[PDB]
Amino acid sequence: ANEVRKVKKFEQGFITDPVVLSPSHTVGDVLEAKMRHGFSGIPITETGTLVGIVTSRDIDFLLLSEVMTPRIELVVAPAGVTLKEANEILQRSKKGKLPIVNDCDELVAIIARTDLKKNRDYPLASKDSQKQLLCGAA
Amino acid sequence: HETAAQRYSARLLQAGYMADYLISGGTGYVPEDGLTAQQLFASADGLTYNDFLILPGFIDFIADEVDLTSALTRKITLKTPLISSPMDTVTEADMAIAMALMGGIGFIHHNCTPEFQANEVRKVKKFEQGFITDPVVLSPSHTVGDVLEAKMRHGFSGIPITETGTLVGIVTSRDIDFLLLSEVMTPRIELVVAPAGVTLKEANEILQRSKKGKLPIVNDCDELVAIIARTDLKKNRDYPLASKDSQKQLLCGAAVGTREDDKYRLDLLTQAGVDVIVLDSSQGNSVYQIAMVHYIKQKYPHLQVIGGNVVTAAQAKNLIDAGVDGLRVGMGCVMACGRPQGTAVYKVAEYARRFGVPIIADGGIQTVGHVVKALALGASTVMMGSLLAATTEAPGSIQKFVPYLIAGIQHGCQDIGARSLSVLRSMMYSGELKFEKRTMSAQIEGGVH
Numbered sequence: 046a047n048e049v050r051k052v053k054k055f056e057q058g059f060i061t062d063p064v065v066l067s068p069s070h071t072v073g074d075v076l077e078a079k080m081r082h083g084f085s086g087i088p089i090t091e092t093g094t095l096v097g098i099v100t101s102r103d104i105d106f107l108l109l110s111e112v113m114t115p116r117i118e119l120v121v122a123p124a125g126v127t128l129k130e131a132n133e134i135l136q137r138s139k140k141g142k143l144p145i146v147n148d149c150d151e152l153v154a155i156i157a158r159t160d161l162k163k164n165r166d167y168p169l170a171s172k173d174s175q176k177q178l179l180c181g182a183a
Numbered sequence: 184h185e186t187a188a189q190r191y192s193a194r195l196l197q198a199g200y201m202a203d204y205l206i207s208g209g210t211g212y213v214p215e216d217g218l219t220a221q222q223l224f225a226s227a228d229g230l231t232y233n234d235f236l237i238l239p240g241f242i243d244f245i246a247d248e249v250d251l252t253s254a255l256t257r258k259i260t261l262k263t264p265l266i267s268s269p270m271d272t273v274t275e276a277d278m279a280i281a282m283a284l285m286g287g288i289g290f291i292h293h294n295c296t297p298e299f300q301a302n303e304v305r306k307v308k309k310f311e312q313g314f315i316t317d318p319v320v321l322s323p324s325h326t327v328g329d330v331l332e333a334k335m336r337h338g339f340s341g342i343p344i345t346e347t348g349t350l351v352g353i354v355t356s357r358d359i360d361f362l363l364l365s366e367v368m369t370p371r372i373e374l375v376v377a378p379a380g381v382t383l384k385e386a387n388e389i390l391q392r393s394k395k396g397k398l399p400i401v402n403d404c405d406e407l408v409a410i411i412a413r414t415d416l417k418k419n420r421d422y423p424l425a426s427k428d429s430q431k432q433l434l435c436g437a438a439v440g441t442r443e444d445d446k447y448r449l450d451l452l453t454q455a456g457v458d459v460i461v462l463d464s465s466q467g468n469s470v471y472q473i474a475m476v477h478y479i480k481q482k483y484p485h486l487q488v489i490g491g492n493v494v495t496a497a498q499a500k501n502l503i504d505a506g507v508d509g510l511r512v513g514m515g516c517v518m519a520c521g522r523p524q525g526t527a528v529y530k531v532a533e534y535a536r537r538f539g540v541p542i543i544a545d546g547g548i549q550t551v552g553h554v555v556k557a558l559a560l561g562a563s564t565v566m567m568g569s570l571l572a573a574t575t576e577a578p579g580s581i582q583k584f585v586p587y588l589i590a591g592i593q594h595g596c597q598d599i600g601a602r603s604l605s606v607l608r609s610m611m612y613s614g615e616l617k618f619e620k621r622t623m624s625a626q627i628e629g630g631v632h
């Protein structure tokens with residue numbers, strides 16, 4: 046059921062199933078996640094999908110808990126956007142993450158700049174009537 | 184300097200229990216067992232490092248108090264008794280920096296155009312630890328494609344920019360990832376540049392606030408002088424074994440040939456500021472090497488000169504009294520001349536020592552045991568050969584690898600019971616250190632084969 050959920054929710058540019066950490070978290074248990082999942086730019090709010098980001102450059106000189114980015118991030122997707130619009134925002138912003146936030150002013154999805162370097166046109170879409178990927182189960 | 188009998192009797196009296204100090208001094212008797220070095224080489228069998236052992240002594244210090252300070256030449260001194268050999272397969276500007284940061288020295292090889300060797304010396308003298316040596320600066324007139332490919336040429340991609348060469352801005356992959364333009368990238372606005380030359384620990388604090396990947400170093404003229412990269416600040420180590428000159432920058436040497444065409448090579452290297460010259464030659468005692476020696480000492484009276492290879496006291500005499508300040512003691516390690524290396528090192532070291540001209544035991548060293556030996560026989564420094572080839576510095580990393588040899592030498596000179604290589608040699612020449620020969624049956628059983 047988890048795998049199928051993961052597959053139905055793909056969204057092309059956005060990160061499927063992003064990791065949010067809790068502002069009540071000393072950085073060592075974030076810094077090791079780079080040793081667990083490999084990625085290391087983590088968005089930060091109470092438990093799930095507010096303050097900004099904790100990112101490798103914030104930690105690479107160091108213990109502390111939340112002496113990193115408050116709610117003060119650069120330009121972001123204000124509700125939900127086309128991938129082509131976020132591609133232009135990343136160009137001006139130069140930063141590596143781009144949050145998407147809802148009208149309640151909380152994170153709802155996130156983008157990574159490295160994936161925007163490599164996303165493609167897929168005319169052979171294989172999408173359902175709800176415009177998201179088809180998948181099967183044995 | 185105190186003998187095993189002096190140290191045992193004194194250190195026993197530090198713990199506590201007469202006419203035993205008054206009837207034989209601090210020499211409270213020890214058995215004679217094994218050969219002094221002068222006896223070992225008396226038989227006129229030509230020994231090499233596999234043929235003898237050093238009978239263990241009395242230990243009264245930890246394996247981390249074995250001072251390794253050695254002397255390279257009459258005036259250059261090193262924190263480590265190692266050297267990288269002047270070979271194309273071993274030493275270039277990268278390994279020369281790596282050796283000096285490990286307290287040794289490196290000699291840049293000479294199998295090249297004279298200009299290339301002078302450039303590789305210049306690259307070593309100007310190291311500065313945290314800063315990027317020889318940064319790449321691009322012109323505001325270039326189209327971005329000829330910057331974006333440099334990432335395909337040199338691999339890095341945060342290029343500082345100004346009129347032709349060492350600031351008006353920067354360009355980085357983040358300025359270029361989405362696209363060809365000619366100039367649209369970050370103009371002068373930079374988040375806390377260094378206004379002049381600064382301490383590396385100050386730049387370490389500036390990068391923490393600034394969060395950017397590059398930190399320009401500028402001058403009161405409002406132009407670049409150097410640049411720092413964040414990735415190097417994450418990793419730069421302590422190097423207390425400094426190997427620095429009086430001007431507080433790295434020592435390095437250069438090999439030169441002895442040909443008539445080499446006064447020009449020697450000029451370019453002395454203009455690049457090289458600290459020491461090794462006269463590369465298969466046999467050093469030649470009229471045109473003694474001419475080359477007299478020529479250097481007549482023209483550049485500051486430059487230290489290490490005499491090309493010898494294996495006899497007669498060769499060592501002719502080069503010393505020509506004025507050289509060192510000696511590569513090694514030859515023939517199929518050619519009809521040469522000497523067994525262990526006998527060469529002992530005989531040349533024992534001769535040179537009369538004048539104070541330390542030697543350099545180059546040739547056929549392939550274990551840390553052989554290093555400890557070559558240092559017990561009289562060599563002041565050991566020149567690591569192809570042992571360093573197939574490391575990542577060779578044209579598994581020299582910075583990580585040299586500490587192994589250091590700890591090995593220290594453990595050795597601890598079992599021998601000598602607290603510092605200078606004491607090891609003093610203990611050898613005074614006949615306090617005892618040696619043993621080894622039949623083939625005694626080394627076919629105990630290692631080696």
Ligand SMILES: Nc1ncnc2c1ncn2[C@@H]1O[C@H](COP(=O)(O)OP(=O)(O)OP(=O)(O)O)[C@@H](O)[C@H]1O
Nearest residue numbers: 060062063064084085086087088101141157159160
């Ligand atoms: N916050 C995140 N939550 C979950 N996965 C993420 C997250 N950030 C990065 N990833 C994973 O890594 C990929 C993007 O890598 P990215 O360039 O963002 O790494 P990074 O955070 O910059 O890593 P690093 O700091 O080590 O360079 C995504 O496709 C996804 O697989």
Ligand SMILES: Nc1ncnc2c1ncn2[C@@H]1O[C@H](COP(=O)(O)OP(=O)(O)OP(=O)(O)O)[C@@H](O)[C@H]1O
Nearest residue numbers: 086098099100101102103114118119140141142394
């Ligand atoms: N959208 C954003 N707006 C503002 N600041 C951000 C944003 N995303 C990340 N940051 C912060 O900016 C700095 C740089 O992070 P960024 O994602 O741009 O690169 P990075 O993950 O450090 O990349 P890299 O590790 O490869 O050098 C960090 O302090 C980070 O917390």
Ligand SMILES: Nc1ncnc2c1ncn2[C@@H]1O[C@H](COP(=O)(O)OP(=O)(O)OP(=O)(O)O)[C@@H](O)[C@H]1O
Nearest residue numbers: 315318319339340341342343356396412413414415
């Ligand atoms: N401007 C430069 N000129 C010359 N060498 C440089 C320069 N910038 C970086 N380097 C080289 O690149 C190495 C790594 O630097 P850095 O991590 O900052 O690369 P970068 O500019 O961020 O490259 P990239 O954007 O591809 O990751 C440095 O140790 C140095 O050897």
Ligand SMILES: Nc1ncnc2c1ncn2[C@@H]1O[C@H](COP(=O)(O)OP(=O)(O)OP(=O)(O)O)[C@@H](O)[C@H]1O
Nearest residue numbers: 139341353354355356357369373374395396397398
């Ligand atoms: N010292 C600086 N002061 C201000 N801006 C700078 C400075 N150095 C670089 N920049 C700019 O800041 C942005 C990010 O540069 P940065 O050095 O962090 O990227 P980078 O590390 O080279 O790229 P990457 O994250 O892929 O490794 C770019 O627009 C760059 O031109």
